[PDB]
Amino acid sequence: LVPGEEWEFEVTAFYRGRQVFQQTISCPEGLRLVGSEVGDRTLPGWPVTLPDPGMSLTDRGVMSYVRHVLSCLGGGLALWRAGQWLWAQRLGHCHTYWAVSEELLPNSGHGPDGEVPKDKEGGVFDLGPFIVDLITFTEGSGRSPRYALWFCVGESWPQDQPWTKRLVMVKVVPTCLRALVEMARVGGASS
């Protein structure tokens, strides 16, 4: 609720492994991934509408499922910063699973870091450990710290299968963290 921790997020959505959307928004109340009309304002956070699968996808059977998923989003998927943590909360009918990974999610079937809670927000990213490892990275640990949040919307997490077969995958990146890692890399650090 207190200013000074506003973060810009780059949101990239994929319908069946196909990038169909990408927007960058810096909002003090964090954001909400909705799948519709943009109305009910009673909810906090800037609403980011995922596109209707019709204007990008050609397959009509797939447009069907995605449309259903996007429709069950209701309040959406809220994400915001508060303190040293990134918080997420599910406000609709679709279970959502998350995991912190590389800019490009690997099919290293390992399972999700967890499920976004619906009753109360849950922490999905801790800035503390990130900075600790960013510093050793500059020293030569050779291990770049992860900052990309990936969400599987409407289906279980793609463990034994390629995420590109999931109806709706969302990638969220805090751009300042991406920048900090790039400066450490350009400063002379390798993986």
Binding site: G4, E6, W7, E8, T24, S26, L127, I131, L134, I135, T138, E139, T175, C176, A179, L180, E182, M183, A184, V186, G187, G188, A189
Partner: protein, 47 residues
């Protein structure tokens, strides 16, 4: 000028908001700013 050389390093596109947020993380984590300053000249010819 120390912050400017770091941002200059941004060989990628950005925005005024991302830049302000990077300076904010740095202002609240002086030990991080110290690492970037130390890494800038850590490279030396050994052996």
């Amino acid at each position: 000028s120390a912050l400017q050389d770091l941002l200059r390093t941004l060989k990628s596109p950005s925005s005024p908001q991302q830049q302000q947020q990077v300076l904010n993380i740095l202002k609240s984590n002086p030990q991080l700013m110290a690492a970037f300053i130390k890494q800038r000249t850590a490279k030396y010819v050994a052996n």
